[PDB]
C-alpha cells in the first residue's frame, strides 16, 4: 500500500514511546537512543513512515 | 533601596489561612513567601502557610517544622523555577516578642537578607493592610521598604471582573498630625531624643512659600485661562442643543 | 437539607402570618447568617417576608437588617418584606427604599425582585403603575425590564 | 437544580498561575471543599502537580506526590474532600484537549458529580474571564434535578453557543458549565478599596502633584492643538450643506463631530480645575 507522505498531527505521548516523524517542511523530528525495531505498529501505525527523507534509525517499515 | 512587590495572588491567599484554621487572637498564622530577592525590585509570586502553634505564656516558644519548609519549597519548583526562599509572612497585627525570635530560622537557608512580612486580617486604620520589614543586624534593625502591589495581565483584569477622591485625601491627611502628636507624648513621658530626631527631620523640612507666593498667583490665573476657554465652548453647545430641541419641535406641530 | 429543609421554611411562614411574634424574628434571621445555603436563605427571606403582614413602621426593625447586610441572599427577600407590610396603603419612605436598592445594587436578580415589590403597594391605585415602569422599560440592562412587566400585571390583571 | 461553581478569591488567581509556564504546554491540578447539591457548590484549595512526559492522561497524576502532599493538607487545616481534577489546556474549537480522553471516565467511578476546570483564555484573555470545563454523562445522571433551567440552557437556535464548535455535543450531553463567584464580608471589603488604578493611595496631594505640573506646560500646548481643530470641522459642516435632507448618507453627521468638540472639551477643563484644587491647598 503505497504511501507518499508519513505525518501526524499534534500527537505527543511519554517521552518513550512518542515519535511523530514529520516529512512536512513545517516541524520536522528526529527520532535518537539506539534501534527500535517493531513488527506492526511502532507508535500510531497506519501512516508511520519514511519515504524519500530517511530520519535516523528505522529502516523496518 | 529595594522595594516590595505584593501580589493580590499573595495577599488573599494569606486571609484564607486564617479562617479555614479557626485562628482566634491567640494564634497568628505563619507562612513562606516565595520570589527573587537578588534584584532591586522584590516580587512574591507564590505563598503558603504552616503547622505554626503559638504559645503566649512563653515567647520562647514556638512549633515550627524544618521538614516542611524544605520538601514544599522543592516540590513546588516543578510550577515555577523562579521561586525561591526570600523569607517568610505571618498573622497578628501586632510584633511581640516571639517574632524576634523566629527570624534567625530561616536566615539559614537564606541567601541574600530576609524579608519579613505582617498580614492584617482586620486592617483597623489608614492604608497597607500588610506591611514588609527586613531582618539586618549590625542588635536588630529593621527598615520599613515601599510596598506596591503588582500583578500579570489576566491577574489585575480578572480582579476588575469579580467587582462588575478628594475628601479621603484630606482626612488621612489630617489624622497623620493626630497619630504624630500621640507618638511625640507617650515617647516624652517614656524616657523620663534620636527617635524624634527623625520625625523633626520630616517636620521641619505661606512659610517657606512666600518668595513663591507672588508667582503661584501668576500660574493660577493662566490656568484659568485655559478653563475660561473651555467654558464658552461648552457654553456653545447649549445654545446651539436649545435651537435644534426647536427643530424637533417644529416638526412635531406640522406632523 | 436541600430538599425537605426549604419547605421547612417556607411552611412555617404560612402559620405566623399576621402580625407574628418578635421572637420567630430573630431566630429565622440568626440562623440565615450562621448555617449557609441559598435555598434556605430564600425560603428564610420569603419566610421573614410572609411573618410581617400590614406592620407598615412596625417591621423597620427587621427591614433595616437586611439592608445593612451586603449578602445578595438576604438583600433578595428584603423587597418583599417591604411589599406585604406596606401593601394597601403605602408611605413616602417605604417607597424610596424600594426605589434606592435597584439603583446602588448591581446585583440583576435584586434589581428585578426590587421593583416587582413596587406593584404589592401600589394595588389600590394603579393609574401610577405604568407611569413608574415607564422609564425603568428603556435600559441597558435586561433585567431591569424583567421585573418591570409582572410588577405592571400584578396590579392590573 | 444543578450545581453551579462558586470560584472563590483564590480559585481564579491560582489557575492562572499554575499554566504560567509556555502557552502550549499544560499542568493539572486537584479541586477540594465539601459541598451539596441544590445550591452549595464550593473549592476550598487549589494545588497543582508536575508537568510528566505523558501530558494529560490516566499516568499523569503521581499517586505518590498526591500522597505525600495530602498529608500535609490535615495539619495546615487545608485538607478537604476532592471535589474534581483542573486542569490547563491551550484549547481547541471542540474537544480543548486531545491528549484527555480515558480520564474523566475514570474520575465519574469514583464520584459521580466530579466536574473538570480548563482555562481557556491561555493568551486570548479578554476581561470576560471565559473559562471551560467538561463533565461525562453517558447512560445515567437522569431521572434527578433540572440541569438545563438553571442559566441560560435549552438553547441551540442555529447552531451558535458558546465556541460554536459544540451545537448538541460538546465534549458529551452537554453539561452546561455556570460559572458565578461568592466571597465573604473580608473578602469584599479588600477589592474594593484596594483595586483601583494604580497604588498612590492613602494620600493623594503630593504623589502626582510634581509629576503633573512639571508636564502642565507642556499640557496647555497639547490642549490648545485639539481646540484648532476643533471649529474647523464645524466650519466645513455647515459650509457644504445648503439643503437639509440626506444625500450625504450622513445619518447621524452632527452628533459625531459635536462630542469631539464636547467631550474633549469636557475631558480638558475638568483635569485642570479638579486637580488644580489639590494643585496648591498650601494654606500655611
Known amino acids: 500500500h503505497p504511501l507518499q507522505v508519513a505525518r501526524c498531527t499534534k500527537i505527543i505521548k511519554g517521552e518513550d514511546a512518542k515519535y511523530v516523524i514529520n516529512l512536512k517542511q513545517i516541524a520536522k523530528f528526529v527520532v535518537g537512543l539506539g534501534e527500535r525495531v517493531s513488527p506492526t505498529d511502532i507508535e500510531e501505525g497506519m501512516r508511520v513512515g519514511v519515504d524519500r527523507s530517511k530520519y535516523n534509525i528505522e529502516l523496518p517499515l | 533601596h529595594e522595594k516590595v512587590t505584593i501580589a493580590p495572588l499573595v495577599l488573599l491567599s494569606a486571609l484564607d489561612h486564617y479562617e479555614r484554621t479557626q485562628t482566634k487572637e491567640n494564634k497568628r498564622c505563619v507562612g513562606v513567601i516565595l520570589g527573587d530577592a537578588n534584584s532591586s525590585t522584590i516580587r512574591v509570586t507564590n505563598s503558603f502557610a504552616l503547622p505554626f502553634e503559638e ?5 520562647d516558644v514556638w512549633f515550627l517544622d524544618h521538614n516542611y519548609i524544605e520538601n ?7 510550577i515555577n523555577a523562579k521561586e525561591k526562599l526570600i523569607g517568610w509572612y505571618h498573622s497578628g497585627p501586632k510584633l511581640r516578642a516571639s517574632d524576634l525570635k523566629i527570624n534567625e530560622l530561616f536566615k539559614k537557608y537564606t541567601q541574600n537578607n530576609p524579608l519579613l512580612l505582617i498580614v492584617d486580617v482586620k486592617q483597623q486604620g489608614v492604608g497597607l493592610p500588610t506591611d514588609a520589614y527586613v531582618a539586618i543586624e549590625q542588635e536588630k534593625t529593621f527598615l ?14 480578572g480582579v476588575e471582573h469579580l467587582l462588575r477622591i478628594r475628601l479621603t485625601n484630606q482626612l488621612k491627611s489630617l489624622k497623620g498630625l493626630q497619630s504624630k502628636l500621640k507618638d511625640v507624648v507617650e515617647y516624652l513621658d517614656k524616657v523620663i531624643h534620636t527617635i524624634l530626631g527623625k520625625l523633626q527631620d520630616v517636620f521641619n523640612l505661606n512659610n517657606l512659600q512666600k518668595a513663591l507666593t507672588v508667582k503661584t498667583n501668576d500660574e493660577l490665573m493662566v490656568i484659568y485661562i485655559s478653563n475660561l476657554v473651555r467654558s464658552i465652548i461648552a457654553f456653545d453647545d447649549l445654545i446651539e442643543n436649545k435651537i435644534q430641541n426647536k427643530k424637533i419641535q417644529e416638526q412635531r406641530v406640522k406632523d | ?25 430573630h431566630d429565622m434571621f440568626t440562623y440565615s447568617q450562621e448555617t449557609q445555603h441559598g435555598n434556605i436563605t430564600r425560603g428564610l427571606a420569603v419566610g421573614l417576608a410572609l411573618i410581617n403582614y400590614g406592620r407598615q413602621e412596625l417591621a423597620d426593625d427587621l427591614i433595616t437588617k437586611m439592608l445593612a447586610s451586603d449578602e445578595s441572599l438576604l438583600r433578595y427577600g428584603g423587597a418583599f418584606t417591604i411589599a406585604l407590610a406596606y401593601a394597601g396603603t403605602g408611605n413616602n419612605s417605604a417607597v424610596k427604599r424600594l426605589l434606592h436598592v435597584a439603583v446602588s445594587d448591581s446585583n440583576d436578580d435584586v434589581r428585578r425582585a426590587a421593583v416587582i415589590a413596587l406593584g404589592f403597594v401600589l394595588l389600590r391605585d394603579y393609574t401610577t403603575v405604568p407611569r413608574i415602569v415607564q422609564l425603568l422599560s428603556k435600559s441597558h440592562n435586561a433585567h431591569v425590564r424583567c421585573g418591570t412587566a409582572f410588577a405592571l400585571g400584578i396590579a392590573c390583571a | 437544580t444543578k450545581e453551579t461553581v462558586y470560584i472563590s478569591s483564590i480559585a481564579l488567581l491560582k489557575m492562572l498561575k499554575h499554566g504560567r509556564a509556555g502557552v502550549p504546554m499544560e499542568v493539572m491540578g486537584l479541586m477540594l471543599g465539601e459541598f451539596v447539591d441544590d445550591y452549595t457548590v464550593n473549592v476550598v484549595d487549589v494545588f497543582a502537580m508536575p508537568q510528566s512526559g505523558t501530558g494529560v492522561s490516566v499516568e499523569a497524576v503521581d499517586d505518590v506526590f498526591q500522597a505525600k502532599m495530602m498529608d500535609m493538607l490535615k495539619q495546615t487545616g487545608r485538607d478537604q474532600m476532592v471535589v474534581g481534577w483542573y486542569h490547563s489546556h491551550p484549547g481547541f474549537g471542540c474537544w480543548l484537549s486531545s491528549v484527555d480522553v480515558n480520564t474523566q471516565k475514570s474520575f465519574e467511578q469514583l464520584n459521580s458529580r466530579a466536574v473538570a476546570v480548563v482555562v481557556d483564555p491561555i493568551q486570548s484573555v479578554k476581561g470576560k474571564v471565559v473559562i471551560d470545563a467538561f463533565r461525562l454523562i453517558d447512560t445515567g445522571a437522569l431521572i434527578n434535578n433540572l440541569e438545563p433551567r438553571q442559566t441560560t440552557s435549552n438553547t441551540g437556535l442555529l447552531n451558535k453557543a458558546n465556541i460554536q464548535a459544540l451545537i448538541h455535543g460538546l465534549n458529551r450531553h452537554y453539561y452546561s458549565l455556570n460559572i458565578d463567584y461568592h466571597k465573604t464580608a473580608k473578602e469584599t471589603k479588600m477589592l474594593m478599596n484596594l483595586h483601583k488604578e494604580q497604588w498612590q493611595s492613602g494620600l493623594k496631594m503630593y504623589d502626582y502633584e510634581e509629576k503633573e505640573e512639571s508636564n502642565l506646560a507642556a499640557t496647555k500646548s497639547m490642549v ?5 481643530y476643533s471649529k474647523r470641522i464645524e466650519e466645513e459642516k455647515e459650509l457644504t450643506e445648503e439643503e437639509l435632507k440626506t444625500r450625504y448618507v450622513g445619518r447621524q453627521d452632527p452628533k459625531k463631530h459635536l462630542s469631539e468638540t464636547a467631550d474633549e472639551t469636557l475631558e480638558n477643563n475638568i483635569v485642570s480645575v479638579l486637580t488644580a484644587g489639590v494643585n496648591s491647598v498650601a494654606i500655611k
Not at chain 3, 437539607?1 to 424574628?25: D, F, Q, R, V, Y
Open chain 2, 144 to 157: 520599613h521598604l515601599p510596598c506596591t502591589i503588582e500583578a500579570e495581565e489576566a491577574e489585575e483584569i
Open chain 3, 1 to 25: 437539607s436541600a430538599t425537605s429543609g426549604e419547605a421547612a421554611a417556607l411552611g412555617m411562614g404560612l402559620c405566623m402570618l399576621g402580625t407574628g411574634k418578635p421572637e420567630a424574628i
Open chain 4, 224 to 228: 490648545k492643538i485639539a481646540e484648532q
Open chain 2, 55 to 59: 504559645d503566649e505564656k512563653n515567647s
Open chain 2, 72 to 78: 514544599m519549597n522543592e516540590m513546588c519548583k516543578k
